Design an enzyme around this catalytic site. Structure first.
Site, PDB file in Angstrom:
ATOM      1  N   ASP A 140       0.842  -1.194   0.000  1.00 53.34           N
ATOM      2  CA  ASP A 140       0.000   0.000   0.000  1.00 53.34           C
ATOM      3  C   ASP A 140       0.879   1.248   0.000  1.00 53.34           C
ATOM      4  O   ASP A 140       1.374   1.653   1.061  1.00 53.34           O
ATOM      5  CB  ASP A 140      -0.886  -0.003   1.249  1.00 53.34           C
ATOM      6  CG  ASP A 140      -1.810   1.186   1.322  1.00 53.34           C
ATOM      7  OD1 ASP A 140      -1.918   1.912   0.319  1.00 53.34           O
ATOM      8  OD2 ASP A 140      -2.440   1.380   2.401  1.00 53.34           O
ATOM      9  N   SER A 145      -0.681  15.728 -11.985  1.00 50.73           N
ATOM     10  CA  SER A 145      -0.958  15.384 -13.370  1.00 50.73           C
ATOM     11  C   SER A 145      -1.198  16.650 -14.184  1.00 50.73           C
ATOM     12  O   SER A 145      -1.717  17.649 -13.686  1.00 50.73           O
ATOM     13  CB  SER A 145      -2.179  14.452 -13.449  1.00 50.73           C
ATOM     14  OG  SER A 145      -2.509  14.153 -14.795  1.00 50.73           O
TER      15      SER A 145
END
EC number: 3.4.23.22
Length: 330
Positions: free
Chosen positions: A35, A199
């Site tokens: 994770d 992004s």
């Protein structure tokens, strides 16, 4: 040193991925959920409340000659999906894919919430975010990667998740045969303890690319892709019959649909998520309503590039002094 381990989807939908991990002496092998969104290595154990264990493999520290109680240490964690776990702490030897760390904090669960009990395939979590998020008290502990970093040939790990198929986590080296083209690196902020990056925008299907900054985290422990409501609406508007359902808890769509791709920007580069990756199947057994793999982040407080996005790429988690993220097509 280096390590290399295969990671395997737990079910037909890729709801999560498990990777075998050797703990203790003699080795006890547990299948853990790696994770990059958390920083605790915790396991089902001989200490877990009996009624809260249903098929998982447990770590028994009393059978490990290298286990030692970390005196006075406790841990307690709550995840974004509402699940939780807590317990006490041992140190022991932990190996992943041939890479061994001695003195790793192994957090032994005394209690786990129902969603963990109900998932017999996941024996615990291995956190790979930054150690500043580790919940051990009163002495915070380091992640497996942080402990191994100095011994590794290069201070990196890579995530190569498969679509309905096994993949690989590598530690200490970049497998240049595992991706196509070049790797595009992008800046990381560690201020929230995550692999947080920005992004450069998105496209829906064959549509034009929209240049817009989207801050979010690279999180292998989250199944879906969570993005701003504007972006998610633009995606689902291209699927006839798709709608946001408050009763189901997100966007659903007719199972008869063909889904369009979704592209996200990494600097000047582009990662394309095929439409099939966005189909999470019937909302309930036999239903013709299917659950979408792209969902709104509006209620979370952070955008999450989870498995839906990451499995479309070869992803480099670079833990050099200034960390960065790299993305390549594959």
């Amino acid at each position: 040193s280096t390590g290399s381990a295969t990671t395997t989807p737990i079910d037909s939908l890729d709801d999560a991925y498990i990777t075998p991990v050797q703990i203790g002496t003699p080795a006890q092998t547990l299948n853990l959920d790696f994770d990059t969104g958390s920083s605790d290595l915790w396991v089902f154990s001989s200490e877990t409340t009996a009624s809260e264990v249903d098929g998982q493999t447990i770590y028994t520290p009393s059978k490990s000659t290298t286990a030692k109680l970390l005196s006075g240490a406790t841990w307690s964690i709550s995840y974004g999906d509402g699940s939780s776990s807590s317990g006490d702490v041992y140190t022991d030897t932990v190996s992943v894919g041939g890479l061994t760390v001695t003195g790793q904090a192994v957090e032994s669960a005394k209690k786990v919430s129902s969603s963990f009990t109900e998932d017999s395939t996941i024996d615990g979590l291995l956190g790979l975010a930054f150690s500043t998020l580790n919940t051990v008290s009163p002495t915070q502990q380091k992640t497996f990667f942080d402990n191994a970093k100095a011994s590794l040939d290069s201070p990196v790990f890579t995530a190569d998740l498969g679509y309905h198929a096994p993949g690989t986590y590598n530690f200490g080296f970049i497998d240049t045969t595992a991706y196509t083209g070049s790797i595009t690196y992008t800046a990381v902020s560690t201020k929230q303890g995550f692999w947080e990056w920005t992004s450069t925008g998105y496209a829906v299907g064959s549509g034009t690319f929209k240049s817009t900054s989207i801050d979010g985290i690279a999180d292998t422990g989250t199944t879906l892709l969570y993005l701003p409501a504007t972006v998610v609406s633009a995606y689902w508007a291209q699927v006839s019959g798709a709608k946001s359902s408050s009763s189901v808890g997100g966007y659903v769509f007719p199972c008869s649909a063909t889904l369009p791709s979704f592209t996200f920007g990494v600097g000047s580069a582009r990662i394309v998520i095929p439409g099939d990756y966005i189909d999470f199947g019937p909302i309930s057994t036999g239903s013709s309503s299917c659950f979408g793999g792209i969902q709104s982040s509006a209620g979370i407080g952070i955008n999450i590039f989870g498995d839906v996005a990451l499995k479309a790429a070869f992803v480099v988690f670079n833990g050099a002094t200034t960390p960065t993220l790299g993305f390549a097509s594959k």
